[PDB]
Design an enzyme around this catalytic site. Sequence first.
Site, PDB file in Angstrom:
ATOM      1  N   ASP A  26      57.494  37.215  64.492  1.00 40.50           N
ATOM      2  CA  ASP A  26      56.092  37.254  63.862  1.00 40.50           C
ATOM      3  C   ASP A  26      56.012  36.997  62.516  1.00 40.50           C
ATOM      4  OD1 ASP A  26      53.828  39.577  65.565  1.00 40.50           O
ATOM      5  OD2 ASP A  26      55.585  38.659  66.458  1.00 40.50           O
ATOM      6  N   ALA A  27      55.476  37.843  61.450  1.00 39.73           N
ATOM      7  CA  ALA A  27      55.669  37.473  60.145  1.00 39.73           C
ATOM      8  C   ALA A  27      54.680  36.364  59.763  1.00 39.73           C
ATOM      9  CB  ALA A  27      56.916  37.072  59.572  1.00 39.73           C
ATOM     10  N   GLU A  28      53.469  36.472  59.013  1.00 36.01           N
ATOM     11  CA  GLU A  28      53.392  37.685  58.470  1.00 36.01           C
ATOM     12  C   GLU A  28      53.191  39.200  59.203  1.00 36.01           C
ATOM     13  OE1 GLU A  28      53.348  39.111  54.448  1.00 36.01           O
ATOM     14  OE2 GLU A  28      54.201  40.097  56.280  1.00 36.01           O
ATOM     15  N   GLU A  68      78.828  69.484  56.935  1.00 33.89           N
ATOM     16  CA  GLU A  68      77.859  69.111  55.416  1.00 33.89           C
ATOM     17  C   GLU A  68      76.273  69.224  55.254  1.00 33.89           C
ATOM     18  OE1 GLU A  68      79.495  65.575  54.089  1.00 33.89           O
ATOM     19  OE2 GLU A  68      79.648  64.575  56.167  1.00 33.89           O
ATOM     20  N   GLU A  78      74.436  59.688  48.362  1.00 33.74           N
ATOM     21  CA  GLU A  78      73.019  59.925  48.471  1.00 33.74           C
ATOM     22  C   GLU A  78      72.734  60.087  46.914  1.00 33.74           C
ATOM     23  OE1 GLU A  78      70.260  59.090  50.338  1.00 33.74           O
ATOM     24  OE2 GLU A  78      71.908  59.779  51.930  1.00 33.74           O
ATOM     25  N   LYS A 132      72.684  68.095  54.585  1.00 34.12           N
ATOM     26  CA  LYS A 132      72.258  66.465  54.474  1.00 34.12           C
ATOM     27  C   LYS A 132      70.958  66.524  53.815  1.00 34.12           C
ATOM     28  CE  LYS A 132      69.465  63.559  57.206  1.00 34.12           C
ATOM     29  NZ  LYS A 132      69.246  62.016  58.072  1.00 34.12           N
TER      30      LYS A 132
END
Length: 408
Positions: A34-36, A114, A177, A116
């Site tokens: 595509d594009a734009e 951990e 992050e 996030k």
Amino acid sequence: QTAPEVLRQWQALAEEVREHQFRYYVRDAPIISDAEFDELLRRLEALEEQHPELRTPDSPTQLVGGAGFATDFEPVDHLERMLSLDNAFTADELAAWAGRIHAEVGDAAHYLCELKIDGVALSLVYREGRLTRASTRGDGRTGEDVTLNARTIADVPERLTPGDDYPVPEVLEVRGEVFFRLDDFQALNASLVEEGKAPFANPRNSAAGSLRQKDPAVTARRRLRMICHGLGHVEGFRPATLHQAYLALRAWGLPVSEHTTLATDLAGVRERIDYWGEHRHEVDHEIDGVVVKVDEVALQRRLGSTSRAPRWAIAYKYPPEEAQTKLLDIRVNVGRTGRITPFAFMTPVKVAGSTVGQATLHNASEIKRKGVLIGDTVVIRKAGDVIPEVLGPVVELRDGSEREFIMP
């Protein structure tokens, strides 16, 4: 409108629309037809309106902004993959994952738990202890060379402090992050207000803006925080479990956290999931959920990944703590000591399950110096978790037909 798997139709679409938006604008080298005009933007745009609660200041379906290094950003090259995370439903099983391990791990693995967080992905490159490039996510393969801007420390060293069982790898690519601390996101949000820019909405977007400055002097004054949460390419190192990687990651003097437990087995894994989410609110900075990784490095390559996410980790994710809605009228409310409190009435919103339209503003100065005005579009955090708050307005929504507060 409590979204169940609608988030899986949205996260994997929106973030898969940034890929081509990177490539198209940042590279003059698009991959698809595509594009734009797309295509997916599109089935994305329509989805965001209905189910309407998926909208965010940083969605690519109410954003366009380039740009090109000043330095703000131009393309680099991640040494390795640089991929996303599969998502555990809010809410539930899961285990489908832990039983997917049945497959080829040998149920005697070891899970790393951990936190996030919310913030902008930042890959860092340290050759022989000298930080060389530090770039944004890009499209996984290649990203925006934000090195100068992140160089403006204070959590991200120019060098790696050496010796006493962790000899700096010939090349080390960590990945983490970048975020603003909840309080002093706000202590900037007002500190400016105007003087060039405007107030940010969330710290999720505040962190993005400050990172991508043209003048690195700008970003040397705002604080920003860095938390390294994994490895990319490595030469002359690599551990055998992830932690292991994290003792090393502070021996060398990289910002690690948390709040990281381990986590012998799936029972202790819900022990932390159900612990945070309840306890998730009461911390320095916003956390979307808990990210669970199989500790032993071998098993990870042994299980492998795909070009979307690893098979060796799921991201468990709580109900979203913020949303975006239209601030219709800040009226008032009366109590028992000295002041009445400007309670900001808005249009309904489903955030943290409960649908709410009653977010608060504490005082006169609280207001104003958040840049809000009657009619504005506003972002609201379920920061208690109880009474809803207001981070900021999204100014790029103009209309100009809405204005300042009064009441005597």
